[PDB]
Amino acid sequence: MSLNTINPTETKAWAQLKEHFAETDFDLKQLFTEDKSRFSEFSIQKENLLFDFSKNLVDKKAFQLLLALAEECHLNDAIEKMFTGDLINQTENRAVLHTALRNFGEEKIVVNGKSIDEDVQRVLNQMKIFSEKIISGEHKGFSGKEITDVVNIGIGGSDLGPVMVCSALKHYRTRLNTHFVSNVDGNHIAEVVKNLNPETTLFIIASKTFTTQETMTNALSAKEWFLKAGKEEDVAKHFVALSTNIEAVKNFGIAEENIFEFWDWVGGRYSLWSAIGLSIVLAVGYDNFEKLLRGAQDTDKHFRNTEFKNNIPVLMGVLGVWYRNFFDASSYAILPYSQYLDRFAAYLQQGDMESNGKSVDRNGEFVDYETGPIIWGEPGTNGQHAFYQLIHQGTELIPADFIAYAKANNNLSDHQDKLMSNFFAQTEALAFGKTKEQVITELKASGKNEEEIAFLTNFKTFTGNTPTNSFIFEELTPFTLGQLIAFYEHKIFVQGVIWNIFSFDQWGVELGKALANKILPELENTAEITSHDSSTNGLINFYKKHK
The domain segmentation of the chain, as residue ranges, is 1-97+291-509, 98-290, 510-547
SS3 content of the chain, % helix, strand, coil (to 5): 55, 10, 35
Way the structure was solved: X-ray
Beta strands 49-52 and 43-46: pairing type? antiparallel
| Strands of 43-46's sheet in order across | 43-46, 49-52, 468-473, 400-405, 331-336, 374-376
Residue 64 annotated as binding site: no
Q: Which among 183, 501, 521 is positioned nearest to 324, based on CA atoms?
A: 501
Q: Which among 70, 61, 66 is positioned nearest to 494, based on CA atoms?
A: 70
Residue 371 annotated as binding site: no
Residue 271 annotated as binding site: no
- Give me the catalytic one of 301, 385, 444, 518: 385
Please tell me what resolution, in angstroms, this structure has.
Answer: 1.6
Determine the Cα–Cα distance for residues 501 and 371; give it in Å rounded to an integer.
8
Determine the Cα–Cα distance for residues 102 and 92; give it in Å rounded to an integer.
23
Q: Residue 488: which residues within 8 A CB-CB, separation 6 or more?
A: 313, 316, 348, 351, 352
- Give me the catalytic one of 36, 114, 194, 513: 513
Beta bridge partners, 241, equal 205, 259
Determine the Cα–Cα distance for residues 163 and 341; give it in Å rounded to an integer.
11
Beta bridge partners, 114, equal 111
479 contacts 298 by C-beta, under 8 angstroms: yes
Q: Where are the beta strands (DSSP E) in 156-275?
A: 177-181, 201-206, 239-242, 259-260
Residue 274 annotated as binding site: no
> What topology does CATH give the domain 1-97+291-509?
Rossmann fold (3.40.50)
Beta strands 259-260 and 239-242: pairing type? parallel
- CA-to-CA dists, residue 70 to 20, 67, 201, 292, 479, angstroms: 17, 5, 50, 29, 28
Beta bridge partners, 447, equal none
Residue 212 annotated as binding site: yes
468 contacts 401 by C-beta, under 8 angstroms: yes
Determine the Cα–Cα distance for residues 481 and 267; give it in Å rounded to an integer.
20
Burial class (CB in 10 A: 0-12, 13-18, 19+), 429: middle
Residue 354 annotated as binding site: yes
385 is catalytic: yes
82 contacts 96 by C-beta, under 8 angstroms: yes
Q: Which among 478, 111, 120, 98 is positioned nearest to 272, based on CA atoms?
A: 98
* 411 membership: H or E segment, kind and range: none
3-class DSSP state for residue 309?
helix
490 is catalytic: no
- CA-to-CA dists, residue 192 to 87, 150, 202, 276, 469, angstroms: 41, 11, 13, 20, 38
Determine the Cα–Cα distance for residues 215 and 250; give it in Å rounded to an integer.
16
3-class DSSP state for residue 380?
coil
Q: Which among 66, 56, 101 is positioned nearest to 83, based on CA atoms?
A: 101
Q: Is the peptide bond before 244 cis (omega within 30 degrees of 0)?
A: no
Q: Kindly report the backbone phi and psi dihedral angles of residue 201, in degrees, each rounded to the nearest multiple of 5, phi listed first.
A: -115, 135
Residue 194 annotated as binding site: no
Determine the Cα–Cα distance for residues 13 and 68; give it in Å rounded to an integer.
6
532 is catalytic: no
Task: Classify each residue of 368-401 as buried b or exposed e, where b means 16 or more C-beta atoms within 10 Å of its C-beta.
Answer: eebbbbebbbbbbbebbeebbeebbeeeebbbbb
Residue 299 annotated as binding site: no
Question: Would you say the CATH fold of 510-547 matches that of 98-290?
Answer: no
Beta bridge partners, 111, equal 114
- Give me the catalytic one of 199, 214, 290, 354: 354
Beta strands 400-405 and 177-181: pairing type? unpaired
Beta bridge partners, 333, equal 376, 400
Q: Kindly report the backbone phi and psi dihedral angles of residue 467, in degrees, each rounded to the nearest multiple of 5, phi listed first.
A: -85, 150
Q: Which CATH number does 98-290 carry?
A: 3.40.50.10490
Determine the Cα–Cα distance for residues 95 and 285; give it in Å rounded to an integer.
30
Determine the Cα–Cα distance for residues 406 and 39; give it in Å rounded to an integer.
19
Determine the Cα–Cα distance for residues 446 and 246; give it in Å rounded to an integer.
73
Residue 158 annotated as binding site: yes
Which amino acid is present at 198? Answer: P
Determine the Cα–Cα distance for residues 369 and 8; give it in Å rounded to an integer.
9
- CA-to-CA dists, residue 279 to 133, 167, 286, 462, angstroms: 14, 12, 10, 46
Q: Which CATH number does 510-547 carry?
A: 1.10.1390.10
